[PDB]
Amino acid sequence: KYSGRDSLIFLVDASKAMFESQSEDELTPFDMSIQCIQSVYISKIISSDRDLLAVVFYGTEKDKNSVNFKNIYVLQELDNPGAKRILELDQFKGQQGQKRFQDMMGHGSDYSLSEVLWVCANLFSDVQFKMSHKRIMLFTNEDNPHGNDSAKASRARTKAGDLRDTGIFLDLMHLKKPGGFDISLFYRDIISSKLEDLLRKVRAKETRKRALSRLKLKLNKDIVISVGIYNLVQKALKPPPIKLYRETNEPVKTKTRTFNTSTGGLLLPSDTKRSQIYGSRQIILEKEETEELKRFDDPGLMLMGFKPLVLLKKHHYLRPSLFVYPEESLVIGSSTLFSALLIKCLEKEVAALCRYTPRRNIPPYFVALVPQEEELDDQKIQVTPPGFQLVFLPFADDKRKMPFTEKIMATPEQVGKMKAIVEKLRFTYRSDSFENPVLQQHFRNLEALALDLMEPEQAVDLTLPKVEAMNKRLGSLVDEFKELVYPPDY
Amino acid sequence: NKAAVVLCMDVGFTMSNSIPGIESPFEQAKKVITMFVQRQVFAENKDEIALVLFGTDGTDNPLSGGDQYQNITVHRHLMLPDFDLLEDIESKIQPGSQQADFLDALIVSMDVIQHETIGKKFEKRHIEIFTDLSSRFSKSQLDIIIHSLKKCDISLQFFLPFSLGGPFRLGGHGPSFPLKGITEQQKEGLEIVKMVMISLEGEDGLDEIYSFSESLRKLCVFKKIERHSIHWPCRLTIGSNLSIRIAAYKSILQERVKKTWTVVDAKTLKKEDIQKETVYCLNDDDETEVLKEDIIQGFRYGSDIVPFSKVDEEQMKYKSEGKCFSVLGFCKSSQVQRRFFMGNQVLKVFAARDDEAAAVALSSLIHALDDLDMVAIVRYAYDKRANPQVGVAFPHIKHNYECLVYVQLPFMEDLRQYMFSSLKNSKKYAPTEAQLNAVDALIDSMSLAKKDEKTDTLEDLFPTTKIPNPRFQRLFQCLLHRALHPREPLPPIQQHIWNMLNPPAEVTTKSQIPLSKIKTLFPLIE
Amino acid sequence: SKFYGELALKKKIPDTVLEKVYELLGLLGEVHPSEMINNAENLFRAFLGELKTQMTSAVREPKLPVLAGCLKGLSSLLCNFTKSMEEDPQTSREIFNFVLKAIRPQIDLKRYAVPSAGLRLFALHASQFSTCLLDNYVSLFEVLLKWCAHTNVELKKAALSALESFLKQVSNMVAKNAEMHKNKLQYFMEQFYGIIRNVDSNNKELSIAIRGYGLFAGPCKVINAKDVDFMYVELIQRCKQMFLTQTDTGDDRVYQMPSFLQSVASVLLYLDTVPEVYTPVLEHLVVMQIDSFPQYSPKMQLVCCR
DNA sequence: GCATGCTCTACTGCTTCGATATCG
DNA sequence: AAGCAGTAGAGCA
DNA sequence: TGCTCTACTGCTTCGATATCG
DNA sequence: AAGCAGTAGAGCATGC
């Protein structure tokens, strides 16, 4: 589903022991859980801001819900992330926050059972949108809540079977009571530890999958194939700057007009023409003629023969390259021809040339279509799309020219020294992780007025190089590498 | 700067010659010249054009004796061209020819440029020369005019007719001469202009000559007339202190027009009697129309809207301390792929000037870097207003120039990656072997590259890097027609446009029976 | 002033509210035309400019419902501010060319909204364009006689009204001129002959034939004064053995009397030298009409009394 | 045989979000 | 609407 | 008389504006 | 471009 969304219930344990400091003086797992919750909401307020969230504490003294069972108390309903809801969730830190929890509910009772899974299910059974993922991240520690009676455990695993009947997926975050894999108890016929990822690897992203265009390619005049033209380097920037009326915190929604032929009144857009002026002579047109003269072809792609992959140099480009793929929605069974043409293009290295008009009215541009094949292994490592890529070519006034009158020689001694320098400064390039300085400091600067913690967190620059960590990686060959064959000496 | 372009025009006797059975060359001549004039007027550049014409039945020349300077008409002078010259060139479709010579047009035009060059700066000049190379000429003076053309510091480009020595329309990625298109005057004139052009320039003189066929589909009408580019100086740094002063120029960019459509109301044919404005109107309710000093530039956050309009972000904005061209590092892996380039312009960091020991140091740098797949990851910015961007610096070792070419790169906010259903392991979408051989015959018989001459360097026609773009051309000719023909509807687009923009139909005739094989072999389409 | 300032802003309104604001600018001009006496000129221009920039264009499908809105808006505005051809034979024929393009069929599409608007435009107002209907009457009659057999309830009786107003408008104009329209009169009368002598089903072709026959029995008495006398004899001799003799008592063919009676009245108003043999047939006819009441329908139940 | 009671699915149109040409 | 370096006219001389 | 400022200036950068699928 | 609903030309069963 495209406009479908994903829910998330955060279940927090507070009966006896997770409120304990583990006889330590570093941190309590309760405030660790509240750290994780506040970080995932401060991430998904700008990353994926239409998911459905909820947070439920179980086991305490009071109970407020819609079914009125004991030891189950919620604070938030399934909704969008609300900045007011996180400004009321941030107060549960420190000793006074623990005291605030203790004097608004306390904790401790003969706590829940199957019934907290029941209130999760009836929390899911009410919201009328579309659902795709339904995960429960439970925050608990112990490995036998059925430490005295077997009917509790039997009805708990039967209730988990009935929740996996409709398939609601729960996978807890186990706390570090041994710091890892030692307490491997019988909490395994319910589900099918790592928290630094949730703490800081979700800073500012966006997620979407649309299509941007659904065109057709014509080979001769009668070979029509239906393709979709996706974009894969979105070139994002900041959300738009809304205008606001001053005091009452409201938008403006301004208007515009045109009038005043030195008589006053109001003129409609029906009496409007366009013009161009050269000195004295002005060529006058109507707007229909202005939009008419940019008409050269139908919307579509036009085949113009083939080419081998040797002349289209990577010096040539003008556009973020798109991606194209066949769909069996318009023309029935065209992926068969596409799979055959893909097979012979990857077997005979050939790449096509085409003429492009994407929208319903546009001057053409020449494109080249390059084949591409997937890569895979056992971990579902799907990293490259099977299909075609569109490189865009310039026409006439783009390739300018330099004055061209410069040529000097060199002498082969510096090749090995430069090899030593590049092998000192050698690294595999990346897989990700060169995040945006301006956007990162902007979203943290917005966060500073959002949650009013203290101040702008200075978002650390990453585009700069570590000058000392390449100074000491280099060494004292800098001055000889300057003046080994070229001394300035003023 | 400023240039003084000269044109030489022949509508002489053989230019009044008939067809071969297809079309006349005189209308091609007038189409080429009117193309040059509309581009060099509608470019709004600062330049002087002069035209000279021979092949009429009059005599307009300050020197004219007998047959020496006979029918040599200096119709035009070195002025800024306007609509008057194109009015004249769609008022000169008459053949109307008496003529004897075409060599002396060059020297009378060069002499009137000698008598014109007073005061202004003319660093460069070009003449485009349109003789017919088949009428009678004379062998009177050659050494003086060769030395004058070598010494005048003015470039020249000559224009042959459509032949050199199937359905040729104007030019369509096809043949020039039908079966044999030469006479004896064409033989002696072509070998004489070949020896003059060889002695003038040399090897580029083999291609310093153009017909009407492929000079229509190439911008070789523009050579040493425009200013080259704009110089960019900076200082490259590697590590702490490897500051080398480096010059750089821009390259291929998505070109755009430089004229604004102007709003004109009806009944006035004017602009200044139009006030176009916006009103700041708080609606929300029954309206209370507000002023501009109520405006908090509020932003969106989740489910609310927050202030910090203007001066707060002027305080806590982002800086990156001036211009910078640093090197992050290098990478020996060739894992920067072909599909992540993401740039609205590409750069050539080139050299410096003024006793370029710095540029021979960069020549040493790139003559080291060129041997292996080791690239550079440059951090670039322009000023404090500019934004920082990392990108690839490709090596480029060539004959005359040694370049490094810089392209931008994505950040890990611009990538997106989602799952696709692959097609190799299919249960319904398997193509069979007769259909495989059909598409193999398709990709055979629809090719464009051909190899020959026993050296196996590739010969490929249809270069979609020299073909001009149709958009500003069609806009310019539609402007000219609505300027002169005062109330007619807009014409159809011209046929030499589609002559430039059409494929060679012989590959379609080669693969027509494959297309029938596809239609009769493959399963259902629609 | 508010709903005239409202539509001159940027093109953002999704066209179906533009339909109702056009019709409101019309209806507001229909009722109370003593407040918009100085600003009823430019509403013509704001309807017409939208008509041009919606209709004359060689690109994009025409915005459909805005045309129906603007057309019935001009229908509401054409009363009380009539710019007829008697002082301006330019804007009138301009509006007529626009409405002829609106009724220009050229295609067999569906959801007949805009030619329905054009039909009732030509119906409810027709006398404003005197001089520019005397040459395209074959074309108008052809497209209307195609539209009256559309097998649609809401469009057929909207076509009939434009048809009858067209005949009633051409009648006075073919009367008041001098002797030049014998071809037009004979062409109309011979097409009415060829329609009254079809025998398959078409009751409506028969009725429109009788109605035009009656409306043209008026201006025939100009020079001849004999064809008038042959007329009404043709009428009774055709009418009597069509409902009074048989299909009189039990049938479905009694839905036709007001046509015959309106025609007989229209010839008898300006007839001279009465025959005085057929009035004992005329009496049996009209008493059969007064008897034949309760198997009727309103909007026919009122014109039977008419 | 003309004017009503009763179903009916394809067409079109508005909203939501995202992408690209534009004057300054 | 904002900045950055090139390129012909003043001011002390 | 040459250097040193100096208002302009082409030309570039995002930025709010407009169009559409 | 996705999607979301609701009108409406178009037929069937029925009365006077």
From Swiss-Prot, chain A:
Region DNA-binding, annotated ranges: 233-297
GO MF term (any one): protein-containing complex binding
Residue positions where Phosphoserine is found in the record: S21, S262, S433, S476
Keywords: Acetylation, Activator, ADP-ribosylation, ATP-binding, Chromosome, Cytoplasm, DNA damage, DNA recombination, DNA repair, DNA-binding, Helicase, Host-virus interaction, Hydrolase, Immunity, Innate immunity, Isopeptide bond, Lyase, Methylation, Multifunctional enzyme, Nucleotide-binding, Nucleus, Phosphoprotein, Systemic lupus erythematosus, Transcription, Transcription regulation, Ubl conjugation
UniProt PTM comment: Phosphorylation by PRKDC may enhance helicase activity. Phosphorylation of Ser-21 does not affect DNA repair.
Signal peptide annotation: none
Main subcellular location of this protein, as a coarse class: nucleus
Protein name as annotated: X-ray repair cross-complementing protein 6
Full-sequence portion shown in this chain: 31 to 534 of 609
From Swiss-Prot, chain B:
UniProt entry keywords in alphabetical sequence: Acetylation, Activator, ADP-ribosylation, ATP-binding, Chromosome, DNA damage, DNA recombination, DNA repair, DNA-binding, Helicase, Host-virus interaction, Hydrolase, Immunity, Innate immunity, Isopeptide bond, Nucleotide-binding, Nucleus, Phosphoprotein, Ribosome biogenesis, Systemic lupus erythematosus, Transcription, Transcription regulation, Ubl conjugation
EC number, UniProt record: 3.6.4.-
UniProt-listed GO biological process terms: activation of innate immune response; cellular response to gamma radiation; cellular response to leukemia inhibitory factor; DNA damage response; DNA recombination; double-strand break repair; double-strand break repair via nonhomologous end joining; hematopoietic stem cell differentiation
Entry PTM: ADP-ribosylated by PARP3.
Subcellular location: Nucleus; Nucleus, Nucleolus; Chromosome
Region (Leucine-zipper): 133-160
Position(s), cross-link Glycyl lysine isopeptide (Lys-Gly) (interchain with G-Cter in SUMO2): K180, K517, K519
Family: Belongs to the ku80 family.
Note, other: Individuals with systemic lupus erythematosus (SLE) and related disorders produce extremely large amounts of autoantibodies to XRCC6 and XRCC5.
Function: Single-stranded DNA-dependent ATP-dependent helicase that plays a key role in DNA non-homologous end joining (NHEJ) by recruiting DNA-PK to DNA. Required for double-strand break repair and V(D)J recombination. Also has a role in chromosome translocation. The DNA helicase II complex binds preferentially to fork-like ends of double-stranded DNA in a cell cycle-dependent manner. It works in the 3'-5' direction. During NHEJ, the XRCC5-XRRC6 dimer performs the recognition step: it recognizes and binds to the broken ends of the DNA and protects them from further resection.
Name this polypeptide is given: X-ray repair cross-complementing protein 5
Species of provenance: Homo sapiens (Human)
The gene coding this protein: XRCC5
UniProtKB/Swiss-Prot annotation, chain C:
Consequence of changing K110N: In a lung adenocarcinoma sample; somatic mutation
Post-translational modification: Autophosphorylated at two clusters, the T2609 cluster and the S2056 cluster. Autophosphorylation induces a conformational change that leads to remodeling of the DNA-PK complex, requisite for efficient end processing and DNA repair.
Subcellular location: Nucleus; Nucleus, Nucleolus; Cytoplasm, Cytosol
Annotated transmembrane regions: none
HEAT repeat positions: 135-170
Highest taxon of the lineage: Eukaryota
Annotated disorder: Immunodeficiency 26 with or without neurologic abnormalities: A form of severe combined immunodeficiency characterized by reduced or absent T and B cells, recurrent candidiasis, and lower respiratory tract infections. Some patients show dysmorphic features, severe growth failure, microcephaly, seizures, and impaired neurological functions.
Subunit-structure text: DNA-PK is a heterotrimer of PRKDC and the Ku dimer (composed of XRCC6/Ku70 and XRCC5/Ku86). Formation of this complex may be promoted by interaction with ILF3. Component of the core long-range non-homologous end joining (NHEJ) complex (also named DNA-PK complex) composed of PRKDC, LIG4, XRCC4, XRCC6/Ku70, XRCC5/Ku86 and NHEJ1/XLF. Additional component of the NHEJ complex includes PAXX. Following autophosphorylation, PRKDC dissociates from DNA. Interacts with DNA-PKcs-interacting protein (KIP) with the region upstream the kinase domain.
Homology family: Belongs to the PI3/PI4-kinase family.
Protein name: DNA-dependent protein kinase catalytic subunit
